[PDB]
Write a protein that binds this DNA or RNA. Structure first.
Ligand code: TRP
Ligand code: MG
Ligand code: MG
Ligand code: MG
Ligand code: MG
Ligand code: MG
Ligand code: MG
Ligand code: MG
Ligand code: MG
Ligand code: MG
Ligand code: MG
Ligand code: MG
Ligand code: MG
Ligand code: MG
Ligand code: MG
Ligand code: MG
Ligand code: MG
Ligand code: MG
Lengths: 103, 16, 110, 56, 142, 117, 150
RNA sequence: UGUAACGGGGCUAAACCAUGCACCGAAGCUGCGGCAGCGACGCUUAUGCGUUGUUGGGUAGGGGAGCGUUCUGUAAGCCUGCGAAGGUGUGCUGUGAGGCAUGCUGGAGGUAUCAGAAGUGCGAAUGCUGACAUAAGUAACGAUAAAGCGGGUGAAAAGCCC
RNA sequence: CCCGGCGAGGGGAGUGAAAAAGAACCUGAAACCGUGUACGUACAAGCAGUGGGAGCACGCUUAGGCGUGUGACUGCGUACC
């Protein structure tokens, strides 16, 4: 029992009860979200998306906190040309738990 | 000071 | 009991003292003495005197019973080095370092 | 002739892989006196192969 | 979640037998190399050997095309004085034929450490039978 | 007002050596050497953040391909199918299913074949 | 710096950096590229700007009633304890107290009280007005200042 | 110098011509999240939001905004032997220069805030001073007039004494 | 008090808040040199990292492809001024 869905400008294959990291959603920390754009669900036999998305498909999950990723170091350096700048960056995420998978 | 070869003309002048 | 002894500012390099030390690391004290005794290096006599001083320490100051007593930890760190001058010739100067070493022997039993 | 780069601390060690010393093991006991000694050598006391040669 | 990774501790492998005979050297190699590297599975792991053991028979009877048979070069250097030895294709088949295929796929397996390891899985026998019954090698075409 | 300097200095230096931890020999010992090692590591990373997305895509495409061939169809045809398979869009990574759920894959292959008929 | 002006060693020949004077800032003992000199930090401040500031300062002290003006202010003897008490009674610790003409006793008291100073009418400076928590000022002084600022 | 005039394997199509449909492929385009300048429109103007369009490679160099260090005030305040500075780790935080916290060490000073002033930031200059590497336990131990043994002394004698 | 050459140096004892303040003495950084443990390393070729990444050791968590250390194998990759 798994299904896959689009959310970050990016897809994910998911079983229910499985926590997953996603690009930030604008949904309060405890609330519940539905993803209607689901690209495939699977049991013993499976529904791929005729056009994209499966009709009855919807994956349900509650957000389970927002956070910021481990800092990454942008380094720029141009040898023998008296130029360099170093820039730090973190990137936001929101973690959902998954409870749905309405086949 | 300086090593003798550096001071010496025949070895030092070498390519004129 | 760890009970240690040591020789500071010994006249030898360390590089030299090690090699003699390395023969002894981990042996029963009994063996080391024999080992050192038939090892033709000045660093042997040095290391011996230290080892001996260590046993007598372990003996007279802590428990003792040398028979069950091993050289469990031995190392030599490089000490301060005495700068001198000699000259090789033309008016040039050569540092030459008379290097010294800090011998250290830890003789315990566990 | 001289180096073009500092040999490393590692390389130094390598070269010394063979510089290490050997013990003895072949230390052997006199049949008369107690005496440890180098094989085929007089003992501290002047025994060798049981007999007492050398008073010193 | 990170995509999968083959793990050396648990790859499958399995054995096979291939008949060189009429088959054209190289068009053969291709598949050997491919199957040797595992590129027909969860190959999906550049850094892991995931290929199959596969042994080749009748390497001497391998086929070539063109005038290749008398004109293919095969050079190597002894690393000495001026020791650039060479040997024509036919000459190779004459003395240790198994070589022809061996080098022909060796060249098509990757580069370095792993690559070399992949090559060990290929057993190339000049003749017809092979003393590997124990591996129970399953025949395959192509 | 004379400025001591040098307490802030070793701050800058240690700030770099720490980043060099793990590097071989001077690269982790000697600032002058470390500051370089630290920079170029950064340079590669910035590059290889972009490479990562390349390397994995071709990783995916490689294994997508065998499985497709495994079900008797090249990668070429197989993506063209899914494309033409009445629109429908689906990541090349998510074809993950090629390794962990081979019926689902074969199932995807058929759906693709049909559009190509 | 103290040394001769002899060139430390030959221009060319020794394997050494150029070197010219042993007093060079790059060298060790002796140097300092831009050694300072005694200097004068006195600024100008226009007449009309100075006055302009005092006004903005007074006219803010009232607005926080930190200025309490009084008819007459003086202590009865040159004894600090007296003044300490007056302030106590007046509910004050930190104070400027600008007196009309200034008297002996009021000055000698407060010389030793740290948070309190006493100035005559002319002695009013800008930092002090702001310095102390409360400026007292006799009504007599007020008229002096009234004019001094025009 | 060695195949050495497809990068190699190898290729009779895996070469060349034509037509056609696939697909791979970049930091280009798009998608999701984020920052910043300039716009406009709406919420609302000692503005900041929300959209939204757009711009953001860069040497010489011009412009803008900042971090931190020393020192004056603020400060007879505040922190500090229930542990200051410095040293060494660790966690967190910022776009960065950084900041905050704290364990260990240390054993006496440190100073928010807002202003003020500069001996204010180092990897290079065959820079300066000191310390420490390297070659290396390598060359060498200074006339090729030469040493052998016995006995003393001594912790130890090829070298001293007889 | 003990080892040692009535040595050097050291270990105890004792003083002290502290001896790890012992006179080569406040703090005690860095280059540099060792001892100990974990992991890697004797079929492998290059600016030594970086993206991937197994195994091992260790902590986790109740598992859950998690933190730390190491880094087989692998894509890319010729330091700075
Ligand atoms: N003695 C030197 C000669 C020499 C001494 N000083 C010099 C100066 C310059 C040139 C030569 C020399 C030699 O070995 O020949
Ligand atoms: Mg002379
Ligand atoms: Mg891309
Ligand atoms: Mg002069
Ligand atoms: Mg001076
Ligand atoms: Mg005037
Ligand atoms: Mg740029
Ligand atoms: Mg300070
Ligand atoms: Mg410097
Ligand atoms: Mg520079
Ligand atoms: Mg020089
Ligand atoms: Mg040599
Ligand atoms: Mg030699
Ligand atoms: Mg010699
Ligand atoms: Mg000290
Ligand atoms: Mg091996
Ligand atoms: Mg090599
Ligand atoms: Mg190679």
């Amino acid at each position: 029992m798994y299904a896959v869905f689009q959310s970050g400008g990016k897809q994910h294959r998911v079983s229910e009860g499985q926590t997953v990291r996603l690009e930030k959603l604008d949904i309060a920390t405890g609330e519940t979200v539905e993803f209607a754009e689901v690209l495939m669900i699977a049991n013993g036999e499976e529904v791929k998306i005729g056009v994209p998305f499966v009709d009855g498909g919807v994956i349900k999950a509650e957000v389970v906190a927002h956070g910021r990723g481990e800092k990454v170091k942008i380094v720029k350096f141009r040898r023998r040309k008296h130029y360099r700048k170093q820039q730090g960056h973190r990137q936001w995420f929101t973690d959902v738990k998954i409870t749905g998978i309405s086949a | 000071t300086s090593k003798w070869f550096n001071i010496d003309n025949k070895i030092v002048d070498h390519r004129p | 009991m760890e009970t240690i002894a040591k020789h500071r500012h010994a006249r030898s390099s360390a590089q030299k003292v090690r090699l003699v030390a390395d023969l002894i690391r981990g042996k029963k004290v009994s063996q080391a003495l024999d080992i050192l005794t038939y090892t033709n290096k000045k660093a042997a006599v040095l290391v011996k005197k230290v080892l001996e001083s260590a046993i007598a320490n372990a003996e007279h100051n802590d428990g003792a019973d040398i028979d069950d007593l091993k050289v469990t930890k031995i190392f030599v760190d490089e000490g301060p080095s005495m700068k001198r001058i000699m000259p090789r010739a033309k008016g040039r100067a050569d540092r030459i370092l008379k290097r010294t070493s800090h011998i250290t022997v830890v003789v315990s039993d566990r | 002739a001289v180096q073009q780069n500092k040999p490393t601390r590692s390389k130094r060690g390598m070269r010394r892989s063979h510089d290490a010393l050997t013990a003895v093991t072949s230390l052997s006991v006199d049949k008369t006196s107690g005496e440890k000694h180098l094989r085929h050598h007089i003992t501290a006391d002047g025994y060798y192969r049981g007999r007492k040669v050398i008073a010193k | 979640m990170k995509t999968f990774t083959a793990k050396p501790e648990t790859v499958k492998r399995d054995w096979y037998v291939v008949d060189a005979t009429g088959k054209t050297l190289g068009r053969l190699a291709t598949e050997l190399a491919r199957r040797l590297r595992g590129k027909h599975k969860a190959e999906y792991t550049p850094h892991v050997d995931t290929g199959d053991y596969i042994i080749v028979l009748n390497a001497d009877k391998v086929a070539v095309t063109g005038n290749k048979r008398t004109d293919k070069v095969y050079y190597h250097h002894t690393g000495h004085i001026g020791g650039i030895k060479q040997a024509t294709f036919e000459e190779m088949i004459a003395r240790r034929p198994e070589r022809v295929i061996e080098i022909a796929v060796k060249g098509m397996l990757p580069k370095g450490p792993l690559g070399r390891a992949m090559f060990r899985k290929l057993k190339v026998y000049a003749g017809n039978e092979h003393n590997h019954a124990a591996q129970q090698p399953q025949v395959l075409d192509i | 007002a004379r400025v001591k300097r040098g307490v802030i200095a070793r701050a800058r230096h240690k700030k770099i050596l720490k980043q060099a931890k793990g590097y071989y020999g001077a690269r982790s010992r000697v600032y002058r050497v470390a500051f370089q090692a630290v920079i170029k590591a950064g340079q590669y990373a910035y590059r290889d953040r972009r490479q990562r997305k390349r390397q994995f895509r071709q990783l995916w495409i490689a294994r997508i391909n065998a499985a497709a061939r495994q079900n008797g169809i090249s990668y070429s045809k197989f993506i063209n199918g899914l494309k033409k398979a009445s629109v429908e869009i689906d990541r090349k990574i998510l074809a993950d299913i090629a390794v962990f759920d081979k019926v689902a894959f074969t199932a995807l292959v058929e759906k693709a074949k049909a559009a190509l008929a | 710096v103290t040394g001769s002006g002899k060139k430390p060693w030959r221009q060319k020949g020794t394997g050494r950096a150029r070197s010219g004077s042993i007093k060079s800032p790059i060298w060790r003992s002796g140097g300092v590229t831009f050694a300072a000199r005694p200097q004068d930090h006195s600024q100008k401040v226009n007449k009309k700007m100075y006055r302009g500031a005092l006004k903005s300062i007074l006219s803010e002290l009232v607005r926080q009633d930190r200025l309490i003006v009084v008819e007459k202010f003086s202590v009865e003897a040159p004894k600090t304890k007296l003044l300490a008490q007056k302030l106590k009674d007046m509910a004050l610790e930190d104070v400027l107290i600008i007196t009309g003409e200034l008297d002996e006793n009021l000055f000698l008291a407060a010389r030793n009280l740290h948070k309190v100073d006493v100035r005559d009418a002319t002695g009013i400076d800008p930092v002090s007005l702001i310095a102390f928590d409360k400026v007292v000022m006799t009504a007599d002084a007020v008229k002096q200042v009234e004019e001094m600022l025009a």
